[PDB]
């Protein structure tokens with residue numbers, strides 16, 4: 001929540017989180033892709049935004065539970081950051097917090113849906129690395 005740009009790596013299937021020019025969100029194993037470089041920033045304590053440096057779009061979660069890219073920052077773009085016991089990070093949707101809907105990636109690299117996520121899954125665990 002912080003100063004240099006980062007990558008976000010998910011060890012479930014070995015993919016980095018990725019934000020595309022058309023507004024779609026997925027994951028990839030190709031460490032050279034320019035759409036995987038991210039800039040995090042802190043609202044207040046334990047709350048963050050996540051932006052793609054190349055396109056300029058913000059990460060968001062919609063009413064059905066899927067991830068997508070937004071040109072303007074809004075309430076659907078805010079997330080709750082947690083440093084877990086095993087020392088990974090998790091991100092929870094603010095607007096849908098009463099249901100425990102997480103950001104996550106499937107074994108095949110496409111995005112998980114909010115309603116299909118739980119505490120304990122490999123899919124929800126992320127690790128920040130330097131670009």
Ligand SMILES: O=S(=O)(O)OC[C@H]1O[C@@](COS(=O)(=O)O)(O[C@H]2O[C@H](COS(=O)(=O)O)[C@@H](OS(=O)(=O)O)[C@H](OS(=O)(=O)O)[C@H]2OS(=O)(=O)O)[C@@H](OS(=O)(=O)O)[C@@H]1OS(=O)(=O)O
Nearest residue numbers: 012105106107108109112115116117118120121122123124
């Ligand atoms: O066809 S299976 O019965 O093998 O199910 C595999 C799919 O289930 C997930 C979770 O999907 S969900 O129901 O929408 O939440 O993974 C779950 O099952 C796999 C298989 O292992 S098992 O011993 O046969 O149950 C487990 O992965 S692993 O430990 O074998 O590496 C998952 O455990 S883990 O969280 O990755 O450690 C297990 O998750 S859970 O405890 O039931 O929540 C899907 O994986 S997912 O993409 O991470 O959501 C599997 O979908 S798949 O693309 O067909 O592989």
